[PDB]
Structure formats: structure tokens, C-alpha cells
Design a protein around this nucleic acid. Structure first.
Ligand SMILES: [Mg+2]
Ligand SMILES: [Mg+2]
Ligand SMILES: [Mg+2]
Ligand SMILES: [Mg+2]
Ligand SMILES: [Mg+2]
Ligand SMILES: [Mg+2]
Ligand SMILES: [Mg+2]
Ligand SMILES: [Mg+2]
Ligand SMILES: [Mg+2]
Ligand SMILES: [Mg+2]
Ligand SMILES: [Mg+2]
Ligand SMILES: [Mg+2]
Ligand SMILES: [Mg+2]
Ligand SMILES: [Mg+2]
Ligand SMILES: [Mg+2]
Ligand SMILES: [Mg+2]
Ligand SMILES: [Mg+2]
Ligand SMILES: [Mg+2]
Ligand SMILES: [Mg+2]
Ligand SMILES: [Mg+2]
Ligand SMILES: [Mg+2]
Ligand SMILES: [Mg+2]
Ligand SMILES: [Mg+2]
Ligand SMILES: [Mg+2]
Ligand SMILES: [Mg+2]
Ligand SMILES: [Mg+2]
Ligand SMILES: [Mg+2]
Ligand SMILES: [Mg+2]
Lengths: 175, 159, 168, 213
RNA sequence: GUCUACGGCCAUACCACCCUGAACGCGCCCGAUCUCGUCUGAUCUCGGAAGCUAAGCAGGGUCGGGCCUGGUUAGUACUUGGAUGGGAGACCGCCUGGGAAUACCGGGUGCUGUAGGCUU
RNA sequence: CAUAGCGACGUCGCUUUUUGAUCCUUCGAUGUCGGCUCUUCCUAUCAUUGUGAAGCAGAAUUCACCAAGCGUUGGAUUGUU
RNA sequence: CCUCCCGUGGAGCAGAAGGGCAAAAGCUCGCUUGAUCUUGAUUUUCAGUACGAAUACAGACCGUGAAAGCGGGGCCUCACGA
RNA sequence: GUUUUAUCCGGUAAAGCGAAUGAUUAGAGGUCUUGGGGCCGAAACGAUCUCAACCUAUUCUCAAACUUUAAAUGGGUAAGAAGCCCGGCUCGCUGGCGUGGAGCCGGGCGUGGAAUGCGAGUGCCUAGUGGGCCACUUUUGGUAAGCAGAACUGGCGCUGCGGGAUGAACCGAACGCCGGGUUAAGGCGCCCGAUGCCGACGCUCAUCAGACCCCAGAAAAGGUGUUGGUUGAUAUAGACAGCAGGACGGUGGCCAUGGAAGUCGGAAUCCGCUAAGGAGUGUGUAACAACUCACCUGCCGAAUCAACUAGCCCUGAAAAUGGAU
């Protein structure tokens, strides 16, 4: 599974009815995927792992994107996941700050790739939850819980290094 | 470097199934084989006479000749890049009727009866069997029950 | 929940070339009339055709075309197989002389029979020469992996329309 | 006299047991597989700690002997000679061969190179899979750190990668430690020596009434 | 509801022990002149009909063993096809389809064909 | 007194100055041992320079580090290496 | 040695091994010579040539058994020669 | 050189060994015997204690030449007009039978009885070849091999082109001579076409950094470098770290002794004082002694500690002409 900016999908599926149970149970999952095709594929992967279901023996009755119910509010996200390292499988709890749940999960995927070299096929997101600022455990997240937060931008690197490419004046980094 | 014995590699092929040794049941002898019908060659090892060669075990052929104890079967054999119709004499212990032919002839008789009945009652009916069509649109009721939320379980080492 | 009918029409595009192909994949591609890279064909979907697509999954990208995709494909790149010749569909008489016995007499009838998979879908589809599409403008993602893992092969459900717009 | 174990580390051949076809096999280096107070009852040693391979490879009988000796020495040092019971769970059943060459200054001396290259039985190794248990130590619940250190020290006698795992089973039984006590109380388990007997709720009622009596 | 004769499938039918068996039957049983076989009329063959269901046999029983069939094990093990996936390797993950077997936990314990009897 | 100096049972490597294994190049030919001569290179350092450690009191020795600048000889026997 | 009980074959079937087999294919008796005279077809190796070996028939003449039947060598896979 | 629908075939992978055949670990419970024997049993081992063998229920681990069970992939056949359904005739075969079987002759039935694709059938003459090699996967011998030998598909040979700097086989793609557009695999500091994006988020400092399939170099083991994560523990009833005290009595506890007195060894871990103290974590004394620790307290006043785990980096890491992301 590749990535992009991930989206949350509510995927509901069920086994096909048989003359053993005319109404098989419906199962719902949250899948964070680039698009609905990958979302359906990951739904089948996960329900094959959990229940004894297959894409051939079952069907997907709903697959719809879940829009964030408050994208204008900064909030803390705790994510419980598991992943395969080069030498085993580990459970992790990670914390992020973002406006959207899908953005937080994307942050998680990038951060796992950056810190643990974990590719997206190795990572199994098993719980995402908005948490109160008192329930946070990661100091890098907790340090932004200041009602009077204040910091400068110390050493501002010139990013327009080629417009102009040649110039007489040397850049200023203090602003 | 392999031997060319007639029964090399037949150790399990011609052995009897588990707890099915001993006397051969007599219905196998009581079967009737006409010319032209389709038989599967199996080759049990209890009867050592009239045995088929190991290349005809699991093959299916058509009966062309009937004797007191055996039948003559025309069975296709692939040798390199050619298929040739071999004729083999096999005792009836090593054969049985092929059910594919029986099902097909029952289908033909049923289709002919359907044609007769449909020409009697006017209305057309479908006879060619179609492959599995795509599933049609339908409604799935929730019955006032929220679908169960599923999440992957955490890893733990078991044993 | 309303589950829609499973789509009965697919557009299949061959995305890999003709070098080093296993015999079963080569045979199934010949049966789908995809003997060249970036050749497209409408395939009626059932168990047999779906399993045939599964066999050649790494070599194709397929999906469910919409009405606009069918219209663009037939109008811009529609060629008929008239007398074993690839003839451009520049007149309705060319369709009528080959398919009129089936009630298909115009571009609209051909498009209707292709889109709503009709009784004479096999005849109408085999009348059409396989579509010879250009390279995808804007490039592919990865032709060597499946669509669900970031590539281009296999079944993308309805993104085949996005593919088609760039492809022809 | 013995080749480096790197020459026979991997499971490259089919299993080659000592049988009527493989004759003339020298004895394995490991002859004893259970040490400590083997006669200790089931409830005496509740804690069970395994050492589990992470690689599909071959462990030599000499390596198993060395690891057994090391773990036994540390367990005797820490927990005393009656405070533990160790079981090696790998038996060296796979015979490894050697095509011996003359180690002199001559190839003309009937060396023949690779002609008739099938070899004579060099030794025996055990085949271990990913997740398979190599050694087990059961003891009192307070010797957990001693068990972990003994298994950690035994790890250094083996080629690949191994993990130490404090199992959830009671001792060497296959029943969970938390569910062991009530099962024994309700007589689904009956102790006998180092293990227990599971008593299902089927069979003659005479076997039921010899229990509860 | 059963039995006898001949069977088909060949344990859901086998094995161990216990209980019951009305009527026909099947048996045990009685005998050795004839037929026929023995070391021995035990077996076999023959001629019977005093007694008996004790046994065979039939039905039932056993938290029975087995066998048959389900659940679990487990979408696990294994596996078709894919990748310029990971890893020094050993090997592992993912995509695309298929998918087991113990232990353990349940249920069941012959069905039936032809011909002929018995059963108020 | 395990680890100044050593290291059984095991186990991981490196090297191509040994000997093998193979037979890819060479059979219209790459002169096949040793010595003599002469130059250069390597370091896994024998000595010397600068150091650390010792079961380094001194003396001698041992272990290790940076380190190949410089040196590493004369003879009897043997075609010898 | 004699007797009873259990005994799915854990024995035996010439030999190597594998398969097969229980009122069997094993053991013991009785009678025997189908291990005989013939023509074709077929299978195995295969080039679909040969040899060898084998399978199913057909025509004689027999053997055995009350008979159904079975038997033209050895229960089958080797034991041979233009 | 395909699927689908029916229908057979198989014994590999897996699994199993409280199922057969072989291999194999440990205890447990019983009671006979040319087991040892057993201390007081000769005397009727008056007795019954141990170890054997045996049996029973369990238990650890296995099989290319074992197997109850048993896949995936795979092999065969069928999916009609040469079929179906009615009559009738022939037979020296078969026979209770007008039986059976085969053949033959008339007649009626097309909804042409899965999908998809394609035009098929057939004969003659015939060259070259009959040294192969390579890659994924399966696989045998071998320590291994750019080694030797098989299976399957593809390729090189016979093949150029784009990429891998370079390269018979890798990745893309196969080729008449050209113009325009667009791609593949691969790339876009400069060589060298293309990021001269105000690209995004992190990780990392190497006095041998690292830098892209095949592929052209590394392991076990370590690090109080840094980054994440798991489990556990302490703390205003004041943690942690520092500085300062107590660290006993019986008892210089018993068996060790030539001194071992807490510390050259063997056993057990007593109690009271309480703030605590192990009849001891170490140094050591010839030995005493003297120190130190774990345990408590004082000052100090807000968080801290431990064991793992895996990312990058570092150590491990030595070769010869001067040199290779
Ligand atoms: Mg290619
Ligand atoms: Mg462009
Ligand atoms: Mg060596
Ligand atoms: Mg091998
Ligand atoms: Mg039972
Ligand atoms: Mg799979
Ligand atoms: Mg060679
Ligand atoms: Mg010359
Ligand atoms: Mg020269
Ligand atoms: Mg050095
Ligand atoms: Mg100089
Ligand atoms: Mg005859
Ligand atoms: Mg015979
Ligand atoms: Mg086999
Ligand atoms: Mg196996
Ligand atoms: Mg066994
Ligand atoms: Mg050759
Ligand atoms: Mg080779
Ligand atoms: Mg050539
Ligand atoms: Mg070619
Ligand atoms: Mg080429
Ligand atoms: Mg190139
Ligand atoms: Mg390169
Ligand atoms: Mg490829
Ligand atoms: Mg161009
Ligand atoms: Mg470049
Ligand atoms: Mg440029
Ligand atoms: Mg390094």
C-alpha cells in the first residue's frame, strides 16, 4: 500500500447469504487509505484476518468517506498500531496533533517510515482516538499545551536561492 | 537412469485405500458396459490381471469392445507433441462409469422434454446454461442493529 | 444499505509489452484480443471472463467504464472489423451493413449495446476492432505492481475512466 | 577434527535420519536432555521460561550440549541443584555428511575430486524452525530473573538469533497458569510426576466415581 | 413390530460386558441303520424331534473403546501468480486467488432390495 | 582472582603468503623450480619514535595503541623453497 | 508334544524391494499336465521399429470341479538375444 | 498452450506420532519374575524397602526410501444433428422369453443446447541442428564455487534500442525510412536532457559517513551517541543524584581450623533494638582489625529510575601499482 494524503473510509461488509444463515452479520471498519479501491482491499484483508471471510464469499455493502466533524479545531490524536520490524512485531502507541484524523494517520505513516523504516504494508492501524490534553503522554505533543505559547523563528533560511541566482547582497536570516 | 518396469512408481497408485482391502465388492462386476460409453480407468491392485498401465490411471476413455471379463477402451495418450488414441484391454475391476456423461445425457433428455413442453405451452424458455452472472442490486437491512466495529488485535508471542 | 448491481461491463487495457510472456498469459491475452501494449477491449463480466482477467492480472489494467468513456472510445477511436479489415466508423452504413440483422444500425445503437450489455453484445463487440490507444499522458504510477499497492496493474474499480481520458 | 558450524548452519538438504539406509552414524554429543529436579511435581515449579529460535537453521548436537551445560551451571549456581528443571526440546536427528579430501600435498593420490562425492556421516544436528522452542526451564516463580539470565547465557552457544519468553503455561504443561489452579480444583487435571493428566467429561462413570471419592 | 433365505452398500454395521425376547422361524439338542468322513459321529454327512432359549441370533443399555459426521484448531499451516518489497544472509511481510490436519468440544450407532412366514 | 596474561565446551568471521575443489582463458606455445640482481608495495610491528596496561620496585619481559619513516645481517650442510 | 483362549494378518507366498491376498494368492490333501497346438489384435520401451515381457480375445485338444467356472506357467513388477 | 459448469485422477507441501511401521526424552501408577537384592527378613524375603524388567495412562522430539488425514498448482473426459425420439428388418452371436446385443432401413424433431477468440483440413519434398548457456522459483551432490546434475517458464545463442557509468542473460521494450505528440524502466546539483518546486514530515556527523534489483563486499557481539517504543518500579506519607551519620546484641552464630570471626568452603536466615542492619554485596587483615555495600536516617525540595526493544551512526572491520556512490 502506497500513500498520499490518506482518507478515512467507513467500510461495511458481510458474507453472502447462504441456506445456513439468511442474514449474516454486518461488520464495519475504519480504513485509512488513499482511495476507496484500496480501502475495500484493506477491508477484505482485515476481515479475512479477524473473521473467516473472503472477498469471493462476501460482499461490501457500503464504502463511504468519513469527513472530519471538526477540521477547524486543533486536537490530540493517540494511535494504537502494530508493525513488523526487521526482527519481530511490535505494538506502538503514538501521539500527534492535527486538525483531521486522516491527517494524523498520514503523519503517523510518515513518522513510522522516518523513525523505524517501516513501510506502509507493515503497519496495522488498530485504533485512532482523540484524547484530552491531560491524557497525553508524549512530551513533544504536551509542550504545545500552553495557553500563552510564544516562540520566535530564529534562523530563517532563504528558500528563494535561485531568484535571483546571482546577487550583490548577502541574505539576512534574522527577521 | 530410471528402470522401465511396468509398475515402477505405482507404490501408492495401485495400493488399496485405508481399510478397503480384501474382497472386491460384486457390484463392480455387476455393472454393464456397452460399446461407446465413457469409463474412467483407475486400476486397483487387488486384481493383478488385465491391469492398465500407470499412464492410463486417472484417464477417461470410450468403450469399443466387450469381452467376457474385460473391455476395450479408446483412450487419448499424449506423447511428446502429439496425442494418439490408444486402444487398451482392461478388466472391468479397473474401470467404472464416468458420471460426466451420465449428467450430460440427463441434461439432454431434460432439455428435450423442456422443448416439447414449451412448444406445447407456447412460451419460450432458456436452455443454454449461462455462466455465473454478476450479482444484482439489492437492499441489505440493518434491522435496527448497528454493524459490529472490527479492529485488528494487538500482537503477542504465543509459543 | 443499497448494494448496487455488480458492474457487467469492463474496459481492459493491456499495459505490459510482448517480451517474455508465459504461455497461459499469452493465450488469454490473445483471447481478449490484446496483442499489443495499450490495446483496449470491452469485456462482458461473468465468472469465466473474470477468471480470465485474474489470470492476466499483472499484464492489464481494467475497470468499469462509464457512458462518457464509452462514447469517447467509440467516437474517437472506433473502428469496425468489416471483411477482416480495420475500417473507420465514418458512416452509419458501415455499421448497418454488418450489424443491421441484429437491430444495430448506428453509432448510437452500437454504444447502447456496448454500454447496456445487450443480447447481441458479443456480435457488437467483436465487430469493433480492438482500440489502439496512445500512451497515458501524464505517465503511469508503476506498471509492474497492482493498483492497490500504488501501481497500475489489476482492477481499479472506476478509475479506469481517469485512465481512459489520458489514454486516448 | 570438526568443521566450523557455518558449513552446516542452513537446512539445505532433505532430512537425513539415522535409519536402515544411513548406517555408521556416530553418536550425538548430547545424551541427556532433562536436568535438575526432574521428579518435582507440577505445582512445585509454576514458572516456565522458554528459549525460542527466530531462524530456520540447524543446531549441532555439540552446540546443544554446550548450551545445556552452561544453563545447568548457572541454574545450579543461582537457584541450587533442586530449585529448577531444564528440558532440551531439540533432538539431533538430522545426519550431516562429509566428503573427506586428503589433506596432503597431492591431488594425483587418488583424490578423484568430485567423483563419487556422496559423503560419510559427519555428525548430527537438530532442525529448528522460526518459533520453535530450544530449551525450557521451569522453577519457582521468584527465580524468573535467574531463568532469564541462564537462557541469555545459553544463547551464546548457538549460531542464529534466539528470544527469551516467559510462557503463560503452568510449568511444562499445556494449560494456562491462571486457569491451572481452578482446573485442578474441579478435577479437570490430575497431577502425575512432572506433568498433569487431563480428565475429560466422557468415558465410563466408574472413572468418574473413582474421582470424587 | 419383527424373523427366515438370497443379497447390495461394506463398522452409523465392529469390539467388551449387562438386560429383555410373545408367535413363527433360526438355532442349540437327540441318534449313527443308511449316504459320507474322521485318532475321536467334536467338525462333516445322514435320520430325527425329548428338552431349552443357557448360548448363537434379535432389540435395548454403557457420562464405554472404535467408527461415521459436524465445531474448533483457523482463514492458521501450506500455496498459484506479482513487485527495482524488507533483510548481509537465513528468511520474512504485502498484493492477487485457493486453503488444510491433530489435540480439544458436540451429535449419531446401520440403511435397504427380492421372495416367504409370524404378530387380533 | 573468569577476563594482568590465558580460554575448555560452543559459536561468528577475515585472508588468499598453504593445500585442495573446479576447468572459465591459453594446446597454429604466455619458456616450467631455486638462487643471484634490482625496484616498489602491504601490515597481521621483530627493532627504532611517541604512548596505554601488568601478577610493571629497579633491570629484563609481557599485552595493547598511533605507526610501514628507517632497518631486518655474515656463514657450515642441502639444487632446494 | 498335547489342550483351551486371544489373535486384521503383526506369518507365509523361491529370491531384492514395493504392491496384493484370510472359509485367500498362505498350509495340507486329491486328481492332474493350460509349462500343450494355432491365427491375428493390443499394452509396455517406443521412432509408436525390433527383442523380451504382458493383457484381452478367437479356434482346437485337454485338466479339475457337482457345477458356475478356472487353467494356455509361477499373484504382479526382472530373470534375457538379430 | 484460456476460462466456466459437471465429473473423475493423485499422495506432494502441510500435518500426525496419547494412529500403524521405524526413531526417541522424562517422570507417574500397578503387580508377576533366574533383575539386582534387603539394611533386623534364612526360619512361610516371619516381613516389605529399593532398583530393574514388564504392563497401563501420560509426556519431549522426528522420517527422501513412514503414515490415518490432506491442500494450492496440476492431468483426463463431457458440454449434441455422428444428438434425441418413434416404428420396422437381419443375425450362423446370446438365449426360459416376442431375451440381450450389434448392425441395417424408414420417419419426426434446430431454442445449433457454456464463455471468449480464431478461417480450417490435408499431402509431398526437405535443409540446418543433434557441444548449449543464463535468470525467478522447485531441486540433487558438494563446505562452497562464475562447480556438477535435473523440473518449469522466459531469455541469450539468432537481438538491435531506452535504463543499470561499464557488462551475452538484469529492468523496459523488440526494430522498414521519417515528422509531431506521449510514455515505459530509469531519472532531473554539474559532467548530462530534465526539480533554477520559496516541495512535505522526520532520522543521521562518521579522525575508514552514506548513497538504489542482478551487483560487485561483510557477521556474531557491543555503545551512558541520538531517536522512537514496551514492560515495570519509586515519589510532598517527600523520590533520584549528591554531601553526612548509624550499618548492632546474643554471635569472634553451627560443621569446617593451623587464623579465618559476615566475606579460602557445607548447610540452613534466629529473634529483640528500632531508623535500619544480610548471623552478609565486595576490598582486605597471617589473623584480629579496619574499610565498603543493602537497609534506614539527616540536608536538599520535583519528578525520577530500571530492564528490554529497533531505527540511523560508531566499534567489531587487516594486503599488497595510485583510485573509485
Ligand atoms: Mg521484461
Ligand atoms: Mg508533458
Ligand atoms: Mg579454518
Ligand atoms: Mg543437498
Ligand atoms: Mg463413545
Ligand atoms: Mg496468499
Ligand atoms: Mg561445464
Ligand atoms: Mg613466445
Ligand atoms: Mg613473454
Ligand atoms: Mg595495525
Ligand atoms: Mg622513502
Ligand atoms: Mg481356448
Ligand atoms: Mg499370471
Ligand atoms: Mg511419490
Ligand atoms: Mg513434511
Ligand atoms: Mg509412531
Ligand atoms: Mg549433448
Ligand atoms: Mg548448472
Ligand atoms: Mg552457435
Ligand atoms: Mg528466436
Ligand atoms: Mg534483444
Ligand atoms: Mg544500455
Ligand atoms: Mg553499476
Ligand atoms: Mg519482472
Ligand atoms: Mg519521436
Ligand atoms: Mg544519470
Ligand atoms: Mg541540465
Ligand atoms: Mg559499519
Amino acid at each position: 500500500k502506497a500513500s498520499g494524503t490518506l482518507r478515512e473510509y467507513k467500510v461495511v461488509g458481510r458474507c453472502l447469504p447462504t441456506p445456513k444463515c439468511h442474514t449474516p452479520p454486518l461488520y464495519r471498519m475504519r480504513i485509512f487509505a488513499p482511495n476507496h479501491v484500496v480501502a475495500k482491499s484493506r477491508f477484505w484483508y482485515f476481515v479475512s484476518q479477524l473473521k473467516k471471510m473472503k472477498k469471493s464469499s462476501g460482499e461490501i455493502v457500503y464504502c463511504g468517506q468519513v469527513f472530519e466533524k471538526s477540521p477547524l479545531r486543533v486536537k490530540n490524536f493517540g494511535i494504537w498500531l502494530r508493525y513488523d520490524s526487521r526482527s519481530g512485531t511490535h505494538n506502538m502507541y503514538r501521539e500527534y496533533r492535527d486538525l483531521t484524523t486522516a491527517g494524523a494517520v498520514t503523519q503517523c505513516y510518515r513518522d513510522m517510515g522516518a523513525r523505524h523504516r517501516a513501510r506502509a504494508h507493515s503497519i496495522q492501524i488498530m485504533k485512532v482516538e482523540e484524547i484530552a490534553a491531560s491524557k497525553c503522554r508524549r512530551p513533544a505533543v504536551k509542550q504545545f499545551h500552553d495557553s500563552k505559547i510564544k516562540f520566535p523563528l530564529p534562523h530563517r533560511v532563504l528558500r528563494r536561492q535561485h531568484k535571483p541566482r546571482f546577487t550583490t547582497k548577502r541574505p539576512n536570516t534574522f527577521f | 537412469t530410471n528402470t522401465k518396469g511396468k509398475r515402477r512408481g505405482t507404490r501408492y497408485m495401485f495400493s488399496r485405500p485405508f481399510r478397503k482391502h480384501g474382497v472386491v465388492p460384486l457390484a463392480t462386476y455387476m455393472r454393464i458396459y456397452k460399446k461407446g460409453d465413457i469409463v474412467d480407468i483407475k486400476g486397483m491392485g487387488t486384481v493383478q490381471k488385465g491391469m492398465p498401465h500407470k499412464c492410463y490411471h486417472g484417464k477417461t476413455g470410450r468403450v469399443y469392445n466387450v469381452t467376457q471379463h474385460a473391455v476395450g477402451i479408446v483412450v487419448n495418450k499424449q506423447v511428446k507433441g502429439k496425442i494418439l488414441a490408444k486402444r487398451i484391454n482392461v478388466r472391468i475391476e479397473h474401470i467404472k462409469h464416468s458420471k460426466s456423461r451420465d449428467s450430460f445425457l440427463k441434461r439432454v433428455k431434460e432439455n428435450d422434454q423442456k422443448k416439447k413442453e414449451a412448444k406445447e405451452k407456447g412460451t419460450w424458455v432458456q436452455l443454454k446454461r449461462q455462466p455465473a452472472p454478476p450479482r444484482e442490486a439489492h437492499f441489505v437491512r440493518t434491522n435496527g442493529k448497528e454493524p459490529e466495529l472490527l479492529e485488528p488485535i494487538p500482537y503477542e508471542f504465543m509459543a | 444499505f443499497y448494494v448496487p448491481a455488480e458492474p457487467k461491463l469492463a474496459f481492459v487495457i493491456r499495459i505490459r509489452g510482448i517480451n517474455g510472456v508465459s504461455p497461459k498469459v499469452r493465450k488469454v491475452l490473445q483471447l481478449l484480443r490484446l496483442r499489443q501494449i495499450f490495446n483496449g477491449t470491452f469485456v462482458k463480466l461473468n465468472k469465466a471472463s473474470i477468471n480470465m482477467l485474474r489470470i492476466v492480472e499483472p499484464y492489464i489494467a481494467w475497470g468499469y467504464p462509464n457512458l462518457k468513456s464509452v462514447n469517447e472510445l467509440i467516437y474517437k477511436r472506433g473502428y469496425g472489423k468489416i471483411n477482416k479489415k480495420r475500417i473507420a466508423l465514418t458512416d452509419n452504413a458501415l455499421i448497418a451493413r454488418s450489424l443491421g440483422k441484429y437491430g444495430i444500425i448506428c453509432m448510437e445503437d452500437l454504444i447502447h449495446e456496448i454500454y447496456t450489455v445487450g443480447k447481441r453484445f458479443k456480435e457488437a463487440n467483436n465487430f469493433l476492432w480492438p482500440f489502439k490507444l496512445s500512451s497515458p499522458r501524464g505517465g503511469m504510477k508503476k506498471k509492474t505492481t497492482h493498483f492497490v499497492e500504488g501501481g497500475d496493474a489489476g482492477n481499479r474499480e472506476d478509475q479506469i475512466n481517469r485512465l481512459i481520458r489520458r489514454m486516448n | 577434527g570438526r568443521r566450523p558450524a557455518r558449513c552446516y548452519r542452513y537446512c539445505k538438504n532433505k532430512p537425513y535420519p539415522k535409519s536402515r539406509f544411513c548406517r555408521g552414524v556416530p553418536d550425538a554429543k548430547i545424551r541427556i536432555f532433562d536436568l535438575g529436579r526432574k521428579k518435582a511435581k507440577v505445582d512445585e515449579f509454576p514458572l516456565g521460561g522458554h528459549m525460542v529460535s527466530d531462524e530456520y537453521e540447524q543446531l549441532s548436537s555439540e552446540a546443544l550440549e554446550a548450551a545445556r551445560i552452561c544453563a545447568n551451571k548457572y541454574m545450579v549456581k543461582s537457584c541450587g541443584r533442586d530449585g529448577f528443571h531444564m528440558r532440551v526440546r531439540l533432538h539431533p536427528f538430522h545426519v550431516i555428511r562429509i566428503n573427506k579430501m586428503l589433506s596432503c600435498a597431492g591431488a594425483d593420490r587418488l583424490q578423484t575430486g568430485m567423483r563419487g562425492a556422496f559423503g560419510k556421516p559427519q555428525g548430527t544436528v537438530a532442525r529448528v524452525h522460526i518459533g520453535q522452542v530450544i530449551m525450557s526451564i521451569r522453577t519457582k516463580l521468584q527465580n524468573e530473573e535467574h531463568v532469564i539470565e541462564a537462557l541469555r547465557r545459553a544463547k551464546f552457544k548457538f549460531p542464529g538469533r534466539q528470544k527469551i519468553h516467559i510462557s503463560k503455561k503452568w510449568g511444562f504443561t499445556k494449560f494456562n497458569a491462571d486457569e491451572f489452579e481452578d482446573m485442578v480444583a474441579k478435577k479437570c487435571l490430575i497431577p502425575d510426576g512432572c506433568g498433569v493428566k487431563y480428565v475429560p467429561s466422557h468415558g465410563p462413570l466408574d472413572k468418574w466415581r473413582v474421582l470424587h471419592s
